[PDB]
Amino acid sequence: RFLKVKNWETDVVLTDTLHLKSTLETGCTEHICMGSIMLPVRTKDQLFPLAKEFLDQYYSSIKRFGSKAHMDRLEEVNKEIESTSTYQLKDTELIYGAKHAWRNASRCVGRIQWSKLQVFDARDCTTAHGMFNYICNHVKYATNKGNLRSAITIFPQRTDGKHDFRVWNSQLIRYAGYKQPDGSTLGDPANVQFTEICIQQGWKAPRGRFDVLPLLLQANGNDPELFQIPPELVLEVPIRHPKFDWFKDLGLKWYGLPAVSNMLLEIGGLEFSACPFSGWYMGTEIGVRDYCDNSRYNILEEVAKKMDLDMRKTSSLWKDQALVEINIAVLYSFQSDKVTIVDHHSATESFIKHMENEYRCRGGCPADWVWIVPPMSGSITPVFHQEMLNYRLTPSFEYQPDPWNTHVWKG
Amino acid sequence: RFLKVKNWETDVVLTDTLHLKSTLETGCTEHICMGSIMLPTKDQLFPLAKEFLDQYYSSIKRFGSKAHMDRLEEVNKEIESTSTYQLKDTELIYGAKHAWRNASRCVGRIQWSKLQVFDARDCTTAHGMFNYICNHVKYATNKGNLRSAITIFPQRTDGKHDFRVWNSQLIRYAGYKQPDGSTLGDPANVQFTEICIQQGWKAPRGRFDVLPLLLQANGNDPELFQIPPELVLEVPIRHPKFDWFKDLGLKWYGLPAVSNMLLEIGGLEFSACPFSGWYMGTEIGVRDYCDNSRYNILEEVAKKMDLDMRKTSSLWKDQALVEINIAVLYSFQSDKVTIVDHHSATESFIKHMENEYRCRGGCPADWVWIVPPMSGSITPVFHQEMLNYRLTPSFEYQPDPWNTHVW
Ligand code: HEM
Ligand code: HEM
Ligand SMILES: Cc1cc(N)nc(CCc2cc(F)cc(CC[C@H]3CCCN3C)c2)c1
Ligand SMILES: Cc1cc(N)nc(CCc2cc(F)cc(CC[C@H]3CCCN3C)c2)c1
Ligand SMILES: C[C@H](O)[C@H](O)[C@H]1CNc2nc(N)[nH]c(=O)c2N1
Numbered sequence: 001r002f003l004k005v006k007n008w009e010t011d012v013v014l015t016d017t018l019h020l021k022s023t024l025e026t027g028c029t030e031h032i033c034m035g036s037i038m039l040p041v042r043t044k045d046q047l048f049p050l051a052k053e054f055l056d057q058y059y060s061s062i063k064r065f066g067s068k069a070h071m072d073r074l075e076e077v078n079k080e081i082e083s084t085s086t087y088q089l090k091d092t093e094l095i096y097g098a099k100h101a102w103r104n105a106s107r108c109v110g111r112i113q114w115s116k117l118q119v120f121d122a123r124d125c126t127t128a129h130g131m132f133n134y135i136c137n138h139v140k141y142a143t144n145k146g147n148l149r150s151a152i153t154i155f156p157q158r159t160d161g162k163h164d165f166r167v168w169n170s171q172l173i174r175y176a177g178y179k180q181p182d183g184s185t186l187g188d189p190a191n192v193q194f195t196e197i198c199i200q201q202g203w204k205a206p207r208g209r210f211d212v213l214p215l216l217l218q219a220n221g222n223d224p225e226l227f228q229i230p231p232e233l234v235l236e237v238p239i240r241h242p243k244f245d246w247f248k249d250l251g252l253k254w255y256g257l258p259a260v261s262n263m264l265l266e267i268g269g270l271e272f273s274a275c276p277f278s279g280w281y282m283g284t285e286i287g288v289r290d291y292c293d294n295s296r297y298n299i300l301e302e303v304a305k306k307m308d309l310d311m312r313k314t315s316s317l318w319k320d321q322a323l324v325e326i327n328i329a330v331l332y333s334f335q336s337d338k339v340t341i342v343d344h345h346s347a348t349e350s351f352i353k354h355m356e357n358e359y360r361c362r363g364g365c366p367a368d369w370v371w372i373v374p375p376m377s378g379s380i381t382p383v384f385h386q387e388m389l390n391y392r393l394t395p396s397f398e399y400q401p402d403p404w405n406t407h408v409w410k411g
Numbered sequence: 412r413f414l415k416v417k418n419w420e421t422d423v424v425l426t427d428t429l430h431l432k433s434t435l436e437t438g439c440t441e442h443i444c445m446g447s448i449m450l451p452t453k454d455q456l457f458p459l460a461k462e463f464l465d466q467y468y469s470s471i472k473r474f475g476s477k478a479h480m481d482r483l484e485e486v487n488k489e490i491e492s493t494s495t496y497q498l499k500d501t502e503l504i505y506g507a508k509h510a511w512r513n514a515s516r517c518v519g520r521i522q523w524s525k526l527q528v529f530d531a532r533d534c535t536t537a538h539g540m541f542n543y544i545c546n547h548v549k550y551a552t553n554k555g556n557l558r559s560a561i562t563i564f565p566q567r568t569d570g571k572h573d574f575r576v577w578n579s580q581l582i583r584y585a586g587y588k589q590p591d592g593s594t595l596g597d598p599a600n601v602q603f604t605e606i607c608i609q610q611g612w613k614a615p616r617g618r619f620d621v622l623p624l625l626l627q628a629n630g631n632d633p634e635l636f637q638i639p640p641e642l643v644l645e646v647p648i649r650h651p652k653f654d655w656f657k658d659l660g661l662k663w664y665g666l667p668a669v670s671n672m673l674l675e676i677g678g679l680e681f682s683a684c685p686f687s688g689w690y691m692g693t694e695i696g697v698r699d700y701c702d703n704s705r706y707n708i709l710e711e712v713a714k715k716m717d718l719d720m721r722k723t724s725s726l727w728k729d730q731a732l733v734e735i736n737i738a739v740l741y742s743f744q745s746d747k748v749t750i751v752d753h754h755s756a757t758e759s760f761i762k763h764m765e766n767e768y769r770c771r772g773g774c775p776a777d778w779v780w781i782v783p784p785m786s787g788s789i790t791p792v793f794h795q796e797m798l799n800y801r802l803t804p805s806f807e808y809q810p811d812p813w814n815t816h817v818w
């Protein structure tokens with residue numbers, strides 16, 4: 001069976017056969033769509049089929065399907081599973097797996113870059129201090145003095161679920177959030193809960209509005225530990241506006257490296273619960289969501305005030321006007337400091353090219369429209385007009401529960 | 412299987428039980444989500460009638476009444492005899508209001524119960540269709556104090572006698588291809604503007620030429636009709652800060668009136684059911700004016716704003732796009748013509764969802780369409796999880812007539 005998607009702006013039509021290789025479920029049924037839902041201990045029983053599917057994929061990609069190197073590897077994995085209950089990926093297989101996990105990430109608009117991912121193998125790591133060291137090196141390498149490079153660092157896979165490696169931060173670099181007694185929030189309200197854990201674990205909070213949070217790191221299922229990322233490794237950009245000189249006086253800054261650190265990487269049935277990865281920012285992530293979400297820094301009010309806008313009725317679109325200025329300021333500040341960033345027009349056009357190429361050479365490109373369309377100026381980006389098929393391929397990145405809700409505390 | 416939907420801006424969580432009433436299919440499976448795809452006999456008819464009549468008599472708190480069972484047998488007898496049946500006026504009104512209520516792609520559904528239903532089932536000719544449509548347009552326009560309305564023409568019988576309005580909307584601007592390459596007027600209507608001239612229309616070949624009506628009664632050849640200009644309320648578009656904005660020569664019409672959809676009630680198919688309400692600002696300013704496949708005025712506007720159009724990263728498209736939409740709102744509000752901005756309409760819809768979950772158990776909703784085409788995440792619907800499913804009565808798409816008509 002074949003399926004067609006249409007771009008209603010260009011009339012370009014594409015044919016997807018790749019969804020046939022989809023095994024995992026979506027959440028939808030014939031009678032309900034969960035397309036807008038944000039989020040909809042493994043034994044030898046099912047592990048070898050999952051290994052086999054992965055290795056078939058792997059040897060296909062290197063034009064060695066059915067070779068003696070292919071059959072021997074299947075056999076070697078088999079006996080390793082039956083005798084040890086799990087197995088170890090070769091270096092080649094791990095790198096392939098991490099790239100294809102990103103390649104299969106249907107919510108990611110930056111996937112044109114998927115093949116250029118620097119993979120750091122941290123499977124020999126045994127302690128939280130060792131994790132801090134691996135993460136510091138990732139940050140230095142990925143940041144590259146503002147000329148950002150995509151990277152992922154992969155800590156040991158799960159075994160019995162009781163010895164997990166976990167980065168408790170949702171991102172490697174994030175600002176603290178402090179609930180005040182009067183109800184207000186200082187800093188990033190998205191991080192108030194994590195900030196409290198850190199303070200409880202002994203972090204001395206400066207209690208400012210842009211305090212980089214400490215790393216909280218869990219090795220081999222032991223209690224997590226606190227480390228401060230050396231400040232010289234944390235690249236930050238002060239936000240100013242190319243025309244509004246009062247904008248710098250808002251005191252805004254943001255960090256340069258987006259580095260997601262709380263997701264699970266799944267390859268051949270193996271689960272890598274600590275696998276921080278980073279790339280570079282699309283400007284709307286900072287300018288639209290980080291600053292202007294009602295539940296984040298929410299500077300829309302103060303920006304519109306200083307622009308002296310008609311703030312009485314919403315039909316003056318003062319909110320939309322303030323948002324564009326903020327996003328201009330973010331792009332201007334980053335470009336001025338030579339810190340890599342991509343605007344939402346560039347990124348979406350690139351994704352369309354990526355997606356067309358994926359259909360031609362791969363037979364499809366799983367895409368989550370709800371997430372690919374930028375959170376401002378949606379229909380003037382070409383993805384808005386682009387029909388997309390969403391399905392889940394493996395290797396994959398998955399969500400996992402916050403560790404502080406599952407962890408058994410040693411004391 | 413009694414589902415929950417979270418709002419991530421407010422942590423508000425609603426439990427959806429209404430989805431279990433869903434009958435039709437979405438297009439998705441467990442293996443694939445098609446949530447962004449634009450478009451996926453006597454025996455079948457009686458269960459459809461029963462399902463509709465059951466929910467009708469429950470809404471009037473007469474489920475299991477003599478009235479209920481009597482109407483049930485009554486329609487059952489008319490089907491076995493005539494192979495169809497006719498709705499009572501009260502059922503027709505209920506059917507129409509609920510097809511709107513169930514329209515998961517519609518952000519304006521909070522007004523669903525205040526709909527004016529015009530019964531045009533006694534109509535027999537295109538001239539009569541025209542009369543009904545003129546009366547609709549005048550009623551709905553109301554000198555700019557717009558009112559919701561639907562006019563319902565005779566139901567399909569054998570598919571050879573279909574009533575059809577060939578226009579996609581009652582009021583739409585013409586679209587002419589140019590010898591030199593591009594398109595003058597509205598590119599979305601170039602083929603329809605063709606079929607009008609190609610059926611007899613005399614085009615003034617301007618940029619904002621109101622299209623004539625092309626009406627089809629009882630599966631006959633359609634006929635051209637010019638809506639009286641005094642019935643077509645239009646708004647000249649100017650900006651409250653930029654005086655040069657008037658010189659662009661832009662205007663739009665006040666009445667959005669969809670005319671090509673099919674209204675399904677109790678298994679009966681009403682293939683001509685023009686319905687109208689009032690515009691959300693972004694429909695005109697984001698889509699109509701700025702879509703690359705439409706009026707595409709963005710470059711001309713930013714040029715007039717003297718913005719740096721050299722790199723995309725200056726956000727000149729975004730900045731223009733806002734000014735254009737501020738103007739559309741300003742123009743309509745200044746001429747006292749009903750319009751709603753995308754912030755008010757989306758906050759209304761959150762309120763309407765809250766009511767539907769409260770007094771009905773749910774509210775089918777299509778996030779891909781509910782979220783406005785600009786400033787999505789500063790609107791409350793962006794952070795609202797929505798469950799999409801098909802309830803009936805419903806509005807459905809239908810093939811364009813000229814592909815089908817046995818001419
Ligand atoms: C190189 C530049 C990149 C850009 C511009 C980019 C951009 C984005 C954006 C805007 C999202 C939407 C999520 C949100 O808005 O919060 C996203 C999601 C995602 N990105 Fe990318 N990304 C990049 C690199 C990467 C890399 C290197 C990886 C992994 C190796 C990755 C994996 C993902 C995944 C798994 C998601 C889905 C998150 C979810 O399922 O909730 N991205 N990306
Ligand atoms: C009264 C104010 C109304 C507003 C503000 C409004 C707004 C909208 C918007 C913005 C859309 C998205 C589609 C697009 O962007 O082209 C839509 C779709 C829709 N509207 Fe409403 N509308 C209103 C009245 C009505 C009425 C009176 C009806 C029927 C009686 C109706 C039925 C529908 C349907 C069926 C769709 C979706 C068609 C589809 O399935 O693709 N609307 N509406
Ligand atoms: C590599 C990279 C590049 C870039 N440019 N941006 C990002 C951040 C986007 C992102 C990627 C991801 F895999 C998971 C989340 C979780 C955040 C969600 C959960 C709850 C609140 N957020 C909606 C975010 C990452
Ligand atoms: C009553 C009303 C009020 C309002 N405020 N707006 C509207 C227009 C929105 C609309 C409603 C609808 F039922 C069908 C379409 C078809 C347009 C699609 C077909 C193919 C390409 N277009 C996406 C539009 C109508
Ligand atoms: C490809 C995609 O489904 C298509 O562009 C849809 C997306 N969402 C939309 N939303 C609205 N309100 N109107 C539209 O025409 C569309 N078009």
Ligand SMILES: C[C@H](O)[C@H](O)[C@H]1CNc2nc(N)[nH]c(=O)c2N1
Nearest residue numbers: 036037038370371793794795796
């Ligand atoms: C409810 C809804 O799914 C949720 O708000 C989603 C919508 N689309 C998104 N798209 C992106 N890129 N990032 C997000 O966080 C979200 N949030």
Ligand SMILES: [Zn+2]
Nearest residue numbers: 028033439444
């Ligand atoms: Zn779906």
